[PDB]
Amino acid sequence: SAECAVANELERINCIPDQSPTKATCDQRGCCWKPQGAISVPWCYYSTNHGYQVEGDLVNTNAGFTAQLKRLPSPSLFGNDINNVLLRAEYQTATRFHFKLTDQNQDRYEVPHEHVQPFQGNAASPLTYEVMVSKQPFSIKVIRTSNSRVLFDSSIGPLLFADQFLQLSIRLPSANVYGLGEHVHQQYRHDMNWKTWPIFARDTVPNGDGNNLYGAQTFFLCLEDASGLSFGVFLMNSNAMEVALQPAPAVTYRTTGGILDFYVLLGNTPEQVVQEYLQLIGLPALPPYWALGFHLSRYDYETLDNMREVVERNRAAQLPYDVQHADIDYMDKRRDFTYNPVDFKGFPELAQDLHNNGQKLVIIVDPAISNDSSPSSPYGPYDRGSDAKIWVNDPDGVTPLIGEVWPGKTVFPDYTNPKCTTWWENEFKLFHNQVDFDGIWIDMNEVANFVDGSVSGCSTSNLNYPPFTPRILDGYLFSKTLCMDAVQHWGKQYDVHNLYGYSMAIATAEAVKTVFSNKRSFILTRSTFAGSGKFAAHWLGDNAATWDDLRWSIPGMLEFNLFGIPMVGSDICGFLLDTSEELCRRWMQVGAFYPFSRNHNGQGYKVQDPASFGADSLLLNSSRHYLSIRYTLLPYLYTLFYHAHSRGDTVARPLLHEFYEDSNTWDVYQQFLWGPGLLITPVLDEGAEKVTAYVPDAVWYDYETGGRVTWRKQKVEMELPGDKIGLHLRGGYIFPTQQPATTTVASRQNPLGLIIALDDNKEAKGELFWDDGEAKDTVANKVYLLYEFSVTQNRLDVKILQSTYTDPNNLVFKEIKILGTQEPSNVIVKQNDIPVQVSPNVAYDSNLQVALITEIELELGKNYTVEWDVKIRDEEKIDCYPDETGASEGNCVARGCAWEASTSPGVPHCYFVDELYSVSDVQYDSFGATAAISLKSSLYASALPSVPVNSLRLSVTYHKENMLQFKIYDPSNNRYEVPVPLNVPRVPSGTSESRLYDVLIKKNPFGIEIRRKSTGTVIWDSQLLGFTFNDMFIQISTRLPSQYLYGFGETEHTAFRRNLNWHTWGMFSRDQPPGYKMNSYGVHPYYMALEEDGNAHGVLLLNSNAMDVTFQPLPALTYRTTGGILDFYVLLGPTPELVTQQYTELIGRPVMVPYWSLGFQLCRYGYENDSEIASLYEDMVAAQIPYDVQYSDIDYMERQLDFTLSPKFDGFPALINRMKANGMRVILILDPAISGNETKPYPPFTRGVEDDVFIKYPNDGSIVWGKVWPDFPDIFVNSSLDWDSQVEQYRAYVAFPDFFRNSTITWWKRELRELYTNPQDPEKSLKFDGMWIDMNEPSSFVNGAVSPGCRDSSLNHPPYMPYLESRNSGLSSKTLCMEGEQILPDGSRVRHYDVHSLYGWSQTRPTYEVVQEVTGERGIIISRSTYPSSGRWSGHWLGDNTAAWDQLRKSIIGMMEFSLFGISYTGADICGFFQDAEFEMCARWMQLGAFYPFSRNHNSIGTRRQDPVSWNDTFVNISRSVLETRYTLLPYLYTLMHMAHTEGSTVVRALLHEFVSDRVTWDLDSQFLLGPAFLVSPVLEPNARNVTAYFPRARWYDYYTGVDINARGEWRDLSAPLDHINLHIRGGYILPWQEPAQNTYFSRQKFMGFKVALDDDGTAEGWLFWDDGQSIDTYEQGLYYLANFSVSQNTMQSHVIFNKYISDANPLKLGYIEIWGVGSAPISSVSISASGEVITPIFIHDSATQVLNINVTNGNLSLHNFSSLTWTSAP
Ligand SMILES: C[C@H]1O[C@H](O[C@H]2[C@H](O)[C@@H](O)[C@@H](O[C@H]3[C@H](O)[C@@H](O)[C@@H](O[C@H]4[C@H](O)[C@@H](O)[C@H](O)O[C@@H]4CO)O[C@@H]3CO)O[C@@H]2CO)[C@H](O)[C@@H](O)[C@@H]1N[C@H]1C=C(CO)[C@@H](O)[C@H](O)[C@H]1O
Ligand SMILES: *[C@@H]1O[C@H](CO[C@@H]2O[C@@H](C)[C@@H](O)[C@@H](O)[C@@H]2O)[C@@H](O[C@@H]2O[C@H](CO)[C@@H](O)[C@H](O)[C@H]2NC(C)=O)[C@H](O)[C@H]1NC(C)=O
Ligand SMILES: *[C@@H]1O[C@H](CO[C@@H]2O[C@@H](C)[C@@H](O)[C@@H](O)[C@@H]2O)[C@@H](O[C@@H]2O[C@H](CO)[C@@H](O)[C@H](O)[C@H]2NC(C)=O)[C@H](O)[C@H]1NC(C)=O
Ligand SMILES: *[C@@H]1O[C@H](CO)[C@@H](O[C@@H]2O[C@H](CO)[C@@H](O)[C@H](O)[C@H]2NC(C)=O)[C@H](O)[C@H]1NC(C)=O
Ligand SMILES: *[C@@H]1O[C@H](CO)[C@@H](O[C@@H]2O[C@H](CO)[C@@H](O)[C@H](O)[C@H]2NC(C)=O)[C@H](O)[C@H]1NC(C)=O
Ligand SMILES: *[C@@H]1O[C@H](CO)[C@@H](O[C@@H]2O[C@H](CO)[C@@H](O)[C@H](O)[C@H]2NC(C)=O)[C@H](O)[C@H]1NC(C)=O
Ligand SMILES: *[C@@H]1O[C@H](CO)[C@@H](O[C@@H]2O[C@H](CO)[C@@H](O)[C@H](O)[C@H]2NC(C)=O)[C@H](O)[C@H]1NC(C)=O
Ligand SMILES: *[C@@H]1O[C@H](CO)[C@@H](O)[C@H](O)[C@H]1NC(C)=O
Ligand SMILES: *[C@@H]1O[C@H](CO)[C@@H](O)[C@H](O)[C@H]1NC(C)=O
Secondary structure (H helix, E strand, O other): OOOOOOOOHHHOOEOOOOOOOOHHHHHHOOOEEOOOOOOOOOOEEOOOOOOEEEEEEEEEOOOEEEEEEEEOOOOOOOOOEOOEEEEEEEEEEOOEEEEEEEEOOOOOOOOOOOOOOOOOOOOOOOOOEEEEEEEOOEEEEEEEOOOOEEEEEOOOOOOEEEOOOEEEEEEOOOOOEEEEEOOOOOOOOOOOOOOEEEEOOOOOOOOOOOOOOOOEEEEEEEEOOOOOOEEEEEEOOOOOEEEEEEOOOEEEEEEOOOOEEEEEEEEOOHHHHHHHHHHHHOOOOOOOHHHHOOEEEEOOOOOHHHHHHHHHHHHHOOOOOOEEEEOHHHOEOOEOOOOOOOOOOOHHHHHHHHHHOOOEEEEEEOOOEEOOOEOOEOOHHHHHHHHHOOEOEOOOOOOEOOEEEOOEEEEOEOOOOHHHHHHHHHHHHHHHOOOOOOEEEEOOOOOOOOOOOOOOOOOOOOOOOOOOOOOOOOOOOOOOOOOOOOEOOOOEHHHHHHHHHHHHHHHHHHHHHHHOOOEOOOEEEOOOEOOHHHOOEEEOOOOEOOHHHHHHHHHHHHHHHHOOOOOEEOEEOOOEOOOOHHHHHHHHHHHOOOOOOEEEEOOOOOOOOHHHHOOOOHHHHHHHHHHHHHHHOHHHHHHHHHHHHHHOOOOEEOHHHOOOOOOOOOOOOOOEEEOOOEEEEOOOOOOOOEEEEEEOOOOEEEOOOOOEOOOOOEEEEEEOOOOOOEEEEEOOEEEEEEOOOOOHHHHOOOOEEEEEEOOOOOOEEEEEEEOOOOEOOOOOOOOOEEEEEEEOOOEEEEEEEEEOOOOOOOOEEEEEEEEOOOEEEEEEEEEOOEEOOOOOEEEEEOOOOEEEEEOOOEEOOOOEEEEEEEEOOHHHOOEOOOOOOOOOHHHHHHOOOEEOOOOOOOOOOEEOOOOOEEEEEEEEEOOEEEEEEEEOOHHHHOOOOOOEOOEEEEEEEEEEOOEEEEEEEOOOOOOOOOOOOOOOOOOOOOOOOOOOEEEEEEOOOOEEEEEEOOOOOEEEEOOOOOOEEEOOEEEEEEEOOOOEEEEEEOOOOOOOOOOOOOEEEEEOOOOOOOOOOOOOOOOEEEEEEEOOOOOEEEEEEOOOOOEEEEEEOOOEEEEEEOOOOEEEEEEOOOOHHHHHHHHHHHHOOOOOOOHHHHOOEEOOOOOOOHHHHHHHHHHHHHHOOOOOEEEEOOOOOHHHOOOOOOHHHOOHHHHHHHHHHOOOEEEEEEOOOEEOOOOOOOHHHHHHHHHOOEOEOOOOOOEOOEOOOOEOOOOOOOOOOOHHHHHHHOEOOEEOEOOOOHHHHHHHHHHHHHHHOOOOOOOOOOOOOEEEEOOOOOOOOOOEOOOOOOOOHHHHOOOOOOOOOOHHHOOOOOOEOOOOEEEOOOOOEEEHHHHHHHHHHHHHHHHHHHHHHHHOOOOOEEEOOOOOOHHHOOEEEOOOOEOOOHHHHHHHHHHHHHHHOOOOOEEOEOOOOEOOOOHHHHHHHHHHHOOOOOOEEOOOOOOOOOOHHHOOHHHHHHHHHHHHHHHHOHHHHHHHHHHHHHHOOOOEEOHHHOOOOOHHHHHOOOOEEEOOOEEEEOOOOOOOOEEEEEEOOOOEEEOOOOOEEOOOOEEEEEEOOOOOOEEEEEOOEEEEEEOOOOOHHHHOOOOEEEEEEOOOOOOEEEEEEEOOOOOOOOOOOOOOEEEEEEEEOOEEEEEEEEEOOOOOOOOOEEEEEEEEOOOOOOEEEEEEEEOOEEEOOEEEEEOOOOEEEEEOHHHOEEHHHEEEEEEEEOO
């Protein structure tokens, strides 16, 4: 039916909570029966026929509205249903709603709360909430206006309102619910899974059976979401009740009487909700200072002497101890207001003894008074009480009810009776006159009774046996308490039971006012109600000495802070059972940080006071150590109690109250805070020396050392030995301290101190409340000191806010401890701006960054300012004067910098001390962060090179889970941005949950911090001095995550890893032969860094302007650019390979090369004619040395003029065609510069002056003329002139095309199309297969332009010249003018000054496109000048090397660096370009060079021939051998290129890419990998016939023998004769290979094979990519073969991923399979499964070498038909 229509089984409200459900009761109650459901879900639920309806409308009133409600016709559940109910709502405050539901005709019981008085005000306006009332069925709804969230919804279930049964169900916005009490909940956040909690005060042990305990708390807090927005609910009802939780989420209150009186409290944070609640029920009492000390107690010390012995022992141990408790043993026969005259003779003297030692006495007092009084043995308390008629009475209202407790048969005082309060006061006065005690411990105030009801039992009434009972222990209300019909002043026990303890605390608080003189005392109670914390402290009851109770103590303590009873703790070491030393040790450690810290032992158990465990025990030493820490921090703790008392803050706090933005804190219950500042992490498990703890997102300092921890927003395993607890100070807070003593009396006479814990912005704040520590109402009477402390910019402000109290002890602040600071210097103290004559001492620990300032005397009660300067250590110094000339003390100071002529090499004399920019408007959004940066120091910014930029914007974008961008730019003016397109997501995906990183914007100074979320490692930190942003000078610095950095180019690095020891490297494209600290052909502002744990990241700066980078040993890196904006991209890894795959995804994946380009190549600068190339070709073929590509340098051209053919090369076209017919490929070189001095028709220049393609001067529009290769026509070029004379007399004037321009692109494609197919003579055509574009830096042999020269000196000689080669010659050195103008594709004008380093990049793509068009095949481009994204279309060679021995290792470093740059096709000129080759060097270089991806032997003009057929037959044999090896491996190499192209894997690989765990590989650059599996270990030294190589922890097989050298993690010297190169295959890999031939054309027709290298587990994996090796976009158009191959359990399987290339019509023939590491057992049989056929191949197994060779050449097997191969061993 539609009545039973409950959408969701989780929204069912249990209709039969009182018994097991049957369809019979569900039918009588008119509900809905459905036994379909999960566990714990109701089967009988309420219909919609149950509830009330609004009659009429909502009549409005002065405070809110009133509504009349009539009951809907439904069956009665428990009888006596109230038909007419009145709703009275009130808008008391902007953040406090109150509504009440009561009977309309009769008056019912309402809680007489002492603090909460009837509201008489009018409705508040505006409100932060809205209230909605539904008419039928009736429901109330409270909605937060700011976000329209429903906080409180009563529609989920019906309103039930009967005489002895009331119910209201509320749907909640979230499942984050806290509170409800008193119970052992076991966890802090509630389990909303069908759990019911009874609330009815009862004397019973807390044990985790979900029973009701000593108090009654109905308040709960709910955290809406991670904004902090929170609300609370409070029900003012004292009757017996239960609260049921359901997973909707919803809360149901079920009570046995009274009214429904609700308060809804709103707050922006959890703490504000608590504050609102406490302001309504009553703010907690401020305890006496001595009560914050440590307390000792036992039930049954037996005699006074035993008690004294305990006192003396603990004193002798010098344990911090201030209060002794006396339990019922001190009394006479367990009677109150008495002491035993025999066993406790001298009790008053004990009190005096404690006082003479600065200790206090707390005595116990029970509510029950012995009724045993006779004339012969009078008992005064009873007689006086009976005379006053102040007892709880039987139902007749006259006869005192008789119960039983400790003294036997007892009467119970009625504390709700005012006469009782007077009696109570008087009794305390008479006993205080006998024994001078300091505080009162009230117990058994539930009220407890050893019998049920009374000695005579309870009557059969509906009060003692109500129709509904709330799941209370034992199932009757009058169990171990009084009869429910018992009569008190406030009402029947049925209504006021839960108020008994509350009422007694009130009466006791009144007594204290009279007995103690103007002294706030201390009241400790067990039974509590809402508002009890205004009078008394609370303890969590009779726990047991178990690890569970230790664990449960923390959530209990946290809840009571919510309830407004912050002075709370559990019995340390357990009340019941004997404690172990370990348990008591780990409890004393955490117990030291309970707000109420007391050790309390039960009767008949082993002693457990700390000194009992022995004077040298670890427990005693540990207890003394952490109790001393507690005493040091009492001023801090006391101030927290002040905030609790004055405002309603929580003292012991949950982590979600401070860090609610992290959902990893919403359920933390094994850690807690004191206030906002002190994190406590205990060990709560037996035998544990480690804990898993959450460290929230803040700066944290180890309390004991003062050092900063590296944890932040991460789960950590904390090492906490038996004597250690986790204590951490939060940054941004100041902690008042006092030198500790054994008592609070003694400590308060000692000097004060400050701990200043600095945050990210280098700031902190604190407070200090200080009074007499004892007097009453010291806050309302305003007799106190209040200080506010603040630190900013190295200045401490000590400000008094209140000063009406004077301390008699002349206290002073003597020490200031600063955490997270640099060494303070020149400390100055002022008192109201007047200098104090003092010379403070500073002790500093540089390792911990902790400073101690002593010999200061800041008198308590006065205002002070303390200022200091900071000293910068040499390692943290940043060059303030990196300029080329003008360094001096004078010019340094003019920049606002500091000068120090230190001697340490590398350290700068002039360094920054101040910041130029400030940060503001820091906003953190879901997909990024933004901030405004504003110039503060205009004068000093203007002393640095170039004009400052005033306004800057910082934009952080979270692109992906592993990639982010941060940009700093000028929002007011468009500045140059690099026009190189990058690949970023269209919509951000760096979702907070998935992303691998966090970003933080810091102040003082401005800095961006990026952290790896998983380990908390900071990979980028710009919080260094030096940030400058001028028009032509921008500086930025970062701290490095370690000392391992790789990248930056292009230059000749000494090693693969950078030397971070004061070294500067310039970047600006230049024609410079590679050298030390010299800028070369390309620019790659990219680096990869290794973190100390082996995680890796990468950083790109997208800037093309001239720049340099500096490395300091901090470690730190600084970037200094001459223009542009700051545009950084960060890749998160975490692996070196994943970083490169991420980097290449951003900048573009490497180009797929043609198969023939992987063959060996020959070139020489200085071929005399076409016949010399023909002779070399024939000789190579004759010698059978494989080679695929022949090149020609600028010799085939007429006078080096581009797009011409020299007469000496008239036969070159025919030769090209002949070579091609035999399978050879030709690459030609093209230069960019075009001659303007031709007398005969020269189409290139004429058609380019017509199209306007050349770079011209900014405004006039003349061509910027340079000089490069073309000679003048009709002159005689003597070859005996020097280089300088030839450039001045023989070189023609040349014009440089602008390759950014559309017209230039069109003109360049036409010239190349006509070079391929000559439009005039169709015979002078040159049918090339690829192009070599050289001299594109652009390079000129003059500086700037032909003389007269350049024009704008401002751009050619810039304000800041980076550390470039020929630094004094300017940016125009060996290049074009910087004023030259270029035009982007969209028409925008740019200066050569901005785009110089993009010149080669801009030429590359057009060249690539035209080659693919004229040849119809993919082709290959090789450029000298490269920029990030250049590898998408071209390869790169490492430039003009020299024939020298050091150049072979430099080649290995260059190839590994270009692999990180995303250029896979690279190599060096084999045998050197400059100087004559030597035989041995050339032989070894041939062996190394055979494993370059780009493997070319190239030589300069003038030198001896260095090609393989130029030496002797020994060389021919070495060359042939190694090159045959190369051609065998081409399928493997080709597959690697495919993987680079498609996935962004690296081809040439440093060992650290595959073995990052071994730190030995972090410095290796003399060996390398091809892909993951092939290790190359060359000889790079002369005369050597051996090589020392490292073998990472893996199985490594000798390539030539198949035998595994056993070297796992070891160095090994390997034999390396002149005709040998050491090659090794890693186990676990399958390598495809093919039989070598003269060139790739013939080789591809031969048989293909597999080398299968098994790992230790006998497994291997590998890949094969195969296509036609030359067509365009074979993978994109789907004409290829791709397969993976695997071996396990002696079976090799083929898994074809894709195949539309290899077929029966086009077979790839499989011939050979070699399996290595098959074991020593003989191989009996080998079988191949192919095309549903079994082929038995020919096989040979060598048991000694463990190599199995399988030959399948006879079976005509094409690879696409191969399924699996299986081999079986001899048993
Ligand atoms: C001192 C104490 O005296 C009275 O308590 C009695 C109680 O009435 C008995 O029920 C009995 O307690 C047993 C528990 O009921 C029973 O469950 C079992 O408890 C287990 C728990 O279930 C386990 O979970 C826990 O791990 O271990 C305990 C025991 O190991 O066994 C209990 C027997 O130990 O005995 C106790 C006495 O031990 C009285 O009712 C209590 O209120 C009273 N405590 C207050 C009085 C005094 C004396 O001045 C103060 O010192 C205390 O601080 C007060 O709280
Ligand atoms: C093609 O050129 C070769 C080589 O030229 C010589 O070496 C050049 C670097 C340069 O110095 C030239 O002036 C040289 O002539 C020519 O072969 C040489 O021919 C001369 C006779 O003219 C002979 O004495 C040399 O031994 C030859 N050198 C070699 C290395 O073989 C050749 O004649 C030219 N071919 C044509 C068709 O002109
Ligand atoms: C590997 O070589 C070392 C070094 O050999 C010398 O240096 C080479 C670069 C080359 O110039 C060789 O001709 C040199 O002999 C061997 O160690 C030397 O062995 C000789 C022979 O007794 C001895 O006299 C030298 O003092 C050694 N020098 C050094 C530097 O150790 C080494 O034995 C070879 N490794 C193995 C295991 O064969
Ligand atoms: C203490 O209280 C008890 C209970 O009220 C009193 O004892 C009862 O006294 C009557 C006679 O008046 C006896 O018949 C009962 O047997 C007693 N009760 C029980 C349960 O045994 C006792 O008089 C009181 N003591 C005083 C007032 O000194
Ligand atoms: C090929 O040339 C090499 C180097 O010119 C010759 O090897 C050298 O021979 C001399 C003796 O004639 C030895 O003293 C050197 O140590 C050798 N140098 C090496 C090995 O690099 C080699 O003999 C020649 N082979 C021939 C002529 O076929
Ligand atoms: C080799 O290729 C096969 C497909 O032929 C890959 O198989 C898939 O592997 C993923 C996990 O990586 C599984 O979720 C898929 O179900 C697999 N598909 C099939 C068809 O089995 C395999 O991962 C590749 N790697 C190797 C060497 O086995
Ligand atoms: C692989 O097996 C083939 C047979 O299918 C072998 O080929 C023969 O080799 C012998 C010895 O050189 C020659 O006499 C025959 O003329 C070869 N026949 C063919 C079909 O070429 C081949 O030698 C084996 N390869 C290896 C390395 O063992
Ligand atoms: C080339 O230069 C040499 C060296 O000075 C000179 O002797 C010779 O005559 C020149 N050749 C010419 C100009 O024919
Ligand atoms: C070179 O190899 C050939 C062919 O194996 C061999 O005959 C010759 O002896 C080897 N040595 C030299 C120096 O020619």
